[PDB]
């Protein structure tokens, strides 16, 4: 029942997934160093094997007005978690 | 009929298709510079619309454990042929 933003947090919290996703700095910004792999592993986790990057991207973009996550303007495959929103949600 | 991985080698062997697919380096890595066009052409050849990159990419994944072709991890549309397997499968 896990949601996408949590799964990314799960991957980032585990230093070993740096092969495909990694922290950038310390203020909640991250980079998908292997975007196709992030989409494939999110596919495994949610039992949806036609998961691909286009669909992963569409889901990430959906969060833009939901105090979850926004896409970083200068960079490719970069997002920044909404610090206040993620903090708030990660309690209930 | 012809199989997907063969059709890709066919496109790669012909210098004029670099607009959509091209060899990268000399160890069997290649890049699809226009993935949608590669898919469109694979669509006509196997007389199979509505072929698109998503169905194509998923088909390529079949090869990853069959000593034909593997997907290059840092990248989006770059793949690498298995020389030994390609050699053996051909004869």
UniProtKB/Swiss-Prot annotation, chain B:
SS bond list: none
Domain of life: Eukaryota
Entire protein: shown range: 310 to 400 of 479
Protein name: Transcriptional regulator ERG
Disease: Ewing sarcoma: A highly malignant, metastatic, primitive small round cell tumor of bone and soft tissue that affects children and adolescents. It belongs to the Ewing sarcoma family of tumors, a group of morphologically heterogeneous neoplasms that share the same cytogenetic features. They are considered neural tumors derived from cells of the neural crest. Ewing sarcoma represents the less differentiated form of the tumors. Chromosomal aberrations involving ERG have been found in acute myeloid leukemia (AML). Translocation t(16;21)(p11;q22) with FUS. Translocation t(X;21)(q25-26;q22) with ELF4.
DNA-binding region: 2-82
Protein species of origin: Homo sapiens
Subunit structure: Identified in a IGF2BP1-dependent mRNP granule complex containing untranslated mRNAs. Interacts with SETDB1.
Family affiliation: Belongs to the ETS family.
Role noted for this protein: Transcriptional regulator. May participate in transcriptional regulation through the recruitment of SETDB1 histone methyltransferase and subsequent modification of local chromatin structure.
């Amino acid at each position: 029942q896990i949601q996408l933003w949590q799964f990314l947090l799960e991957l980032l919290s585990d230093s070993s997934n740096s092969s495909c996703i990694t922290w950038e700095g310390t203020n909640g910004e991250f980079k998908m160093t292997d975007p196709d792999e992030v989409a494939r592993r999110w596919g495994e986790r949610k039992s949806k094997p036609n998961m691909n990057y286009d669909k992963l991207s569409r889901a990430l973009r959906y969060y833009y007005d939901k105090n979850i996550m926004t896409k970083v303007h200068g960079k490719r495959y970069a997002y920044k978690f909404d610090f206040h929103g993620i903090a708030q949600a990660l309690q209930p």
